[PDB]
Amino acid sequence: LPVLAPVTKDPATSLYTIPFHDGASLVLDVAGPLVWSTCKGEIPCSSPTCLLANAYPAPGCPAKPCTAYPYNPVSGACAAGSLSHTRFVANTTDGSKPVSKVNVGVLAACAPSKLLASLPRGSTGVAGLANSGLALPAQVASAQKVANRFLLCLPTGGPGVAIFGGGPVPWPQFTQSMPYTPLVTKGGSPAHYISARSIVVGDTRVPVPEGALATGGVMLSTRLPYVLLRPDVYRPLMDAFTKALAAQGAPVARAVVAVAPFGVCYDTKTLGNNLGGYAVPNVQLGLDGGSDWTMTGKNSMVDVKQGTACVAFVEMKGVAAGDGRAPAVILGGAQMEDFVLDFDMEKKRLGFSRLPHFTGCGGL
C-alpha cells in the first residue's frame, strides 16, 4: 500500500517535516534528489546506485567506495558523505487514514552534523522529494511496489499530509474535480516544473514579455515560504500588486521599512482581513490545462514581526532578466499550503486543488 506520514510546519523556520525514525524528522525538499541524515555514531562508486546518487551535483561541490554530497537547501552548504541503508517508519493507508505500521528500507546519505545548521529542531536531515531515483517517493515506489507518485497537503499549522505511492486521491469533497498541468522535466534538474502563461492581479492582467512565462518556467520549492521571481517578471508583478493594493474611506495601506529579504512591507494595522487572509489583491497564475493557481493574502503576504507583513514576491539576485536558463517563478511553501498536490511522475502531471477557506491541510 501507499505510505502516509503527517507533515508539521516548524514555527521557527517555516520548513515542513515528516517523522523519519526514533523521534527524528526530515525536512521536505521538493527539489532535493537525496534522502540524507546524520548517522549512528558499502556501495561501489561505479555502480548504478552511486550514479543515481551523484546524478545532480550539489551547487558548491565537485565529485573505491561511493561518495554522495548531501545539500542543505537552506544554508546552501554541502559536504561529503557515504550512502547507507536506513528505515523510513510510517503508517500504510488506503485513502488518508492509517491502516498500520510499516518499515521501508531506503538508501540515504550520511551527513556530518554541521549540515543540520539552519534546519528545524528534531530534524536529523532532509527527505528529497524530487524526480530522481534516490528521492524518497521513487524509493518508496520500488520498495513497496506502488506508483512513482506522491501527494502533499502542506499545512499552515497542525498536522498535514504526505502520501507516497498514489492510488486514488482522497477527500473527493475537495478533490473530485482536481485540475492537472504537465510536469516539465528540465535538463540537468530533478526539480518539478510547471508552465504558466499569464499572471492576473485583481482584474488587471500583468504585462510580461510573451514567453518570459515559457514551458517549465515555474518551479516548486519548500525551501523558502515566499515566491522568487525573475526581474522581467518581478517589476511588472510588484508594480501591479502595490497599485491594486493602494486603490482598494477604508484605511489605505502604509508601506514600512523593508525587512530582509523582502522588497515591500506594510503596517498590519493598515491592512484589512478577509476570509482569504490579509485584504490584498488576489493573484492568479494561469497554468497550462486551463485552470488557475490562486494566491490570496495567506499566500502573498508573510508575517515577519508583530506589526509587519511583507509581500511574498522576492526578486532573484545574480540573474539577468529574461534568461531562459532560470525559472521565471519559484513558488514556495506558503503558496502551496492548503492545496492538495498530486505529483504524478508516471503520467508527468501535477494535480492541484485549492482547499476552500473553511478548511486546511492541518488536521485534514
Partner: protein, 184 residues
C-alpha cells in the same frame, strides 16, 4: 432588516454578486475557486431569529446555503448549513439538534494558524450545525439560532461574548451555480 453585506472571492472564475433591495441578494458563478456572499447583520446575536427565502438554489458542484458568522473572546467561526450541493460538509461529530422542522448533526473543527476576522495567522474552533438532509427552498424559512447555540453549549461548544457579523450566506467552491436569497 439587514445592515451588512458579506462579499468575498479568491478571484477564481466569475462571481457576479448583486447587493439587492433591503435584504435581497443574488449570486451567479462559474468555474470558481471560492467565494462567500451573504446578507445579515454587523452585530450577530445568539437570540436572533433569521428568516429567509431562497428563491433560487442552483449549485452545480459544491456550495452551501448557510447561516455564517463570527464571535471574538473567544474567536469562533460558525455555520448552520441548511442545504448544499454535491457534498455535505462534515467534521468531528459531537451530537444532534432538532430545530425548525429539520434535524442537524453538530460538528467542530480546529483551525490552526489560519485566516480570521482578527488576523492572518490565527488559531480557533469552528462550530457547525449541518442539516441531515437538504432543506426545501423556495418557501419562507426560519433559523432559530438559539436552539443551535444551546445545543452547542450542551456539548462544550461555547461562543464568545463579543459578536461580529452574522449573515445568511452562499458559499461556493470549485463549482458553478446560482443563488437568490432574501433575508430579514
Amino acid at each position: 432588516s439587514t445592515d451588512y453585506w458579506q462579499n468575498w472571492t479568491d478571484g477564481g472564475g466569475i462571481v457576479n454578486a448583486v447587493n439587492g433591495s433591503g435584504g435581497n441578494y443574488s449570486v451567479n458563478w462559474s468555474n470558481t475557486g471560492n467565494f462567500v456572499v451573504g446578507k445579515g447583520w454587523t452585530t450577530g446575536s445568539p437570540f436572533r431569529t433569521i428568516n429567509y427565502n431562497a428563491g433560487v438554489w442552483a449549485p452545480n458542484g459544491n456550495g452551501y446555503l448557510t447561516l455564517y458568522g463570527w464571535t471574538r473572546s473567544p474567536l469562533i467561526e460558525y455555520y448552520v448549513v441548511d442545504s448544499w450541493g454535491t457534498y455535505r460538509p462534515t467534521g468531528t461529530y459531537k451530537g444532534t439538534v432538532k430545530s425548525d422542522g429539520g434535524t442537524y448533526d453538530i460538528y467542530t473543527t480546529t483551525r490552526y494558524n489560519a485566516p480570521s476576522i482578527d488576523g492572518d495567522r490565527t488559531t480557533f474552533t469552528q462550530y457547525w450545525s449541518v442539516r441531515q438532509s437538504k432543506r426545501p427552498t423556495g418557501s419562507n424559512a426560519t433559523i432559530t439560532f438559539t436552539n443551535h447555540v444551546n445545543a452547542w453549549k450542551s456539548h462544550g461548544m461555547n461562543l464568545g461574548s463579543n459578536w461580529a457579523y452574522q449573515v445568511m450566506a452562499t458559499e461556493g467552491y470549485q463549482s458553478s451555480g446560482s443563488s437568490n436569497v432574501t433575508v430579514w
